């Protein structure tokens, strides 16, 4: 089964898909292609929990019911800067204006 994700670090958002049976490490490989950083320098998160390389995305709670095309699940990304890992940061999206009176 395909799971539909937003991989997010700082002000960067990747939209991609993966198989539920895919592993966390394979998703770090996917990120490596796009953002050009090796898995050794990446940490992937669910909310605040670091994900172990060997577990499948389903074991980490990314499922077809959860990670859907129109509502994808979020995976946090943190990078290693020469031997030290940064703290997990995800810049929020912009805030919507207040609803017009006409609504």
């Amino acid at each position: 089964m395909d799971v539909f994700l937003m991989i997010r670090r700082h002000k960067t958002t990747i939209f991609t898909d993966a198989k539920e049976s895919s592993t966390v490490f394979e998703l770090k490989r996917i990120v490596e292609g796009i953002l050009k950083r090796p898995p050794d320098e990446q940490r992937l998160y669910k909310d605040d929990q670091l994900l172990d390389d060997g577990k499948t995305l389903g074991e980490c709670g990314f499922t077809s019911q959860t990670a859907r095309p129109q509502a994808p699940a979020t995976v946090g990304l943190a990078f290693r800067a020469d031997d030290t890992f940064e703290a997990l940061c995800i810049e929020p999206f912009s805030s919507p204006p207040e609803l017009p009176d006409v609504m």
Binding site: F4, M6, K11, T12, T13, I14, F15, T16, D17, I34, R68, P69, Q70, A71, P72, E91, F93, S94, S95, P96, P97, L99, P100, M103
Partner: protein, 86 residues
């Protein structure tokens, strides 16, 4: 391969080239980064979720789910969709 769509407030959205190539306006803008000076990120994130949605359900006899749009982002999403014709 991927392309990068940048919102007005500087968030960089990285999507698959074929997903972004669904829009002809984005196709024109590309011919590997596009900057949208009028579309904030809460709007552009939904734009990319629509790309995922459209490519997934376009040719399927499986029941198609609704594309959800919160009331607060409706007007801005509409303007962006009118500009991009999508």
């Amino acid at each position: 391969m991927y392309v990068k769509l940048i919102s007005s407030d500087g968030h960089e959205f990285i999507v698959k080239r074929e997903h972004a190539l669904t829009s002809g306006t984005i196709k024109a803008m590309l011919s590997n980064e596009v900057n949208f000076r009028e579309i904030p990120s809460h709007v552009l994130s939904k734009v990319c979720m629509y790309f995922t949605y459209k490519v997934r359900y376009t040719n399927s006899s499986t029941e198609i789910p609704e594309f959800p749009i919160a009331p607060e982002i409706a007007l801005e999403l509409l303007m962006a969709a009118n500009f991009l014709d999508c």
